[PDB]
Amino acid sequence: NYGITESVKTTRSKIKIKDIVSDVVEKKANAIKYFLEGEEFKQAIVFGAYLSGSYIAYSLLKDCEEVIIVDIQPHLKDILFNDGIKFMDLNKLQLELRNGTSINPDLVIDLTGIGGVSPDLISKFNPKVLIVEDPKGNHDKGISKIDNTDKRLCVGAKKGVLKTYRSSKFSKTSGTMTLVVDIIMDSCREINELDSVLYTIPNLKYFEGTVFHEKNVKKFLTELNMSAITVSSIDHVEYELEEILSKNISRVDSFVKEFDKLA
Amino acid sequence: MNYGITESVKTTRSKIKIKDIVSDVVEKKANAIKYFLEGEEFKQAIVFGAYLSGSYIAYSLLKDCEEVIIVDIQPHLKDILFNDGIKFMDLNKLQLELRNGTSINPDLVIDLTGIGGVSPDLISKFNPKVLIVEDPKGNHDKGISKIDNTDKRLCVGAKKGVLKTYRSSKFSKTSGTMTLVVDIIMDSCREINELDSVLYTIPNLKYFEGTVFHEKNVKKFLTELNMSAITVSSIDHVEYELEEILSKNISRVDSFVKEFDKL
């Protein structure tokens, strides 16, 4: 399409924010898959539905008979896309733990990160495998101080820490939201330098507010259908726009590092 | 300022709104013109290009100009004018009145249309005391220089001037108010993200130009500008630094009319 006049072009990227989220959640899910080495489980409990928790739970359905997503926010059941996954709010979980025997997972995954699940609640399980997502990205004193990932690695015969970074680029956290935003912002800066570009728009907003303040998952999902970037230019930049975004998405590297505990 | 996903993370929306950035930029352009005019009074001022800075620049000319007329190829842009003292004419109505009338004979002509805008031929039909042409070019870009014809538009007026707007020490592709606002926001984000404890920084941007020229909805566009320029997720307070970074980037904008002497 054209801009203000036919002398300027407007190009909306084919890559949408949801395609960026998808690629990142998938890398996290594949990092977990690789660490699990094809092991099968009777009951998997995943803490934290947003943002990568939903796909990671879907990915566990193949080798896990029962997959339970647990979240402190009951409205996050709406972020699950597959009915095979069971959703439990934190109160219902804690209630069932005390007055029941149905909760005894062999796989526990903590994806809550900063200010999330307490090591105390994790200590109530005895799984074969414990995976804790490390929210820390590149160095930041403020984030390191509030982080307690090591304290959460208190159960499981096998323990692992899910780490996610961008090769050659700086990111403050390993969070899917942070990574998507950083991939978009870095692509923007390089796209603006392409010949004939007037300006580059990253189609961003505080998406996290839609999910946790407005409590509207449906609206949040609609907001992710937006082109990641919109560019105003004199010449065609469509090909270079997709290449810069794809290259930045490809920088994402996710892996589970085994936390050695001999006893 | 509010909590994010949990009480361990804060969300800070900047006090500075996108409209405050737009306002500061348009005002710098209007003051650059004011300074160049040296208090000279005019009977009829014609301003080509209502969007984005033309609206305020026309309002600023009302003091020393008896009649101020905004001319735009888009008739719906009459909605971007905020003062009823500014007369609005579409390009057809102007061209018609020029041929079959004598009411159009301005002593002050201002072309703010930039890229793919007013033709030097239409400018040649006037004989003002002062001609000011806004140069859309920012920092060097071959694609933009090729399409630019600012020098060809400086064909009339006893006194000629070129309105130039740049960001001191920073790169911008154009002098456009939209380009500058976007670049100020993006550069502020880059620096804000480096503050200690910041997780991620969101520039609240979108293709605002599309709302004005594709959707043809000025009202919606104006509402979209009321949004905070930046939203930050952090562990610690960044509210004061967030405003300081933005203010410093807004201050980098330098607008001036360079006299194009001729005899």
Add this chain to the structure above:
Amino acid sequence: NYGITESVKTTRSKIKIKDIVSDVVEKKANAIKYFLEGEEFKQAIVFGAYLSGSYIAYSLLKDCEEVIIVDIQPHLKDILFNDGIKFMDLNKLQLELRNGTSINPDLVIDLTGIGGVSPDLISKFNPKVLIVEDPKGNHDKGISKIDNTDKRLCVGAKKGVLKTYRSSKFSKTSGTMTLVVDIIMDSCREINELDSVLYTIPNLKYFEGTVFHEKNVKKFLTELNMSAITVSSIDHVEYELEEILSKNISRVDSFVKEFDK
């Protein structure tokens, strides 16, 4: 080609600082050539021997019968590589201008920039063509304040301003040195992001000091033979290193903008 151990490689760029200087001076000389449209001159006077002036004077020898380089520093005669170019210091030029008739150029080119040639000295000529190099690059208030390029365009039937920028990149001035330094620095940042790179070294120093403080052109020319960049990496980066540098050299765009009457 190994570093501290055989597990790390050291790669010195094939492109030398002199190759970057050469490419930038040639772009400036070609910008002037295109503006002159093949016009022939009897006497060309070029103010400012360092850094592009030397090559620009050499490039004028084809269409100019006499080419004179003028400079406030007499030792800069050493930066001229062709004996066909005549060298005069600023004092000798001013003396001859006042008490003589041998100086009456039809082509005047001012390349001194910041704190250089006075509009008063330029006003003493009546050439067919005048070219003033604009030292300003991208926007900077401090540099704009001290700049007086417009005041120097006071003579010549045809006037032009030599402008040089880097497309899509920020540079404070249009000066050859600054452009070489900025090309090197920007290449280094992108090279550091290549996979397996540990660190990237721009082989820079205050080269200007060797020329104007130490007053040693020979040493300065030897200093330019160094590789522009040295990289420590686990994997091969030879070709990417040359591609990033070449792309940054290619961003340089020089042109003479005609100043009407």
Add this chain to the structure above:
Amino acid sequence: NYGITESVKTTRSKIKIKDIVSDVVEKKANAIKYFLEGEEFKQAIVFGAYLSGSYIAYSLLKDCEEVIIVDIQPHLKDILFNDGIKFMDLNKLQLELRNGTSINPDLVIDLTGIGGVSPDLISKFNPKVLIVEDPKGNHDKGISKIDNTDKRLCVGAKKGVLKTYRSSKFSKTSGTMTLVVDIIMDSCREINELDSVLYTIPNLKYFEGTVFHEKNVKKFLTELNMSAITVSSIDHVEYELEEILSKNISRVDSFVKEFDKLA
């Protein structure tokens, strides 16, 4: 000092490369000091004299009766400034281990990083404390692949990993040379943006080559006495130049992260 004419000022930074090196080696030595909690040792063995190793060995003399620096390069004995530090080449250490009993350290520190000490040689010791310097900085696939820091933490009752990063900035390694170079380069970017600056020169060269190819420590030490940055500007920037460098040096954060065997 002036430049080409008196209209331009040349400013050489008061901060020398050696001062930036000093701040980085000292932070590493203080990170180790803090981790050791004042514990005293009979024999400390430090692998890798260059670059931070020499000062780290000097810092251990207070609480260690015997401090031995071990290096694969015999000429690196020249980088040690204090005669109290005993120097042994790699061959001499391995020979004495097999045909002797004088080598039985209670403190082992591996600072060799990439392509350095083999876990096999580390396995030959039985110290009270083992500290392995992690050479990895922020994420890079190539560097992570060649890194084997975890495999080197095979001995010691107490294990620690010395990590060094730049808060909010990207660095490929934790190496003293990499950090100094990155601090200088980042300071240049910001210094170049100061008003009136024409250009900024980082006074860098391949210093590592002087030490390992030319095998001249003396020359290397002389090369570090140079000002870190030289700036050409119209106005005074002395105070800002030192402030930008100091702020970048301050971003360096070194710490030993404990690895608990719990056995």
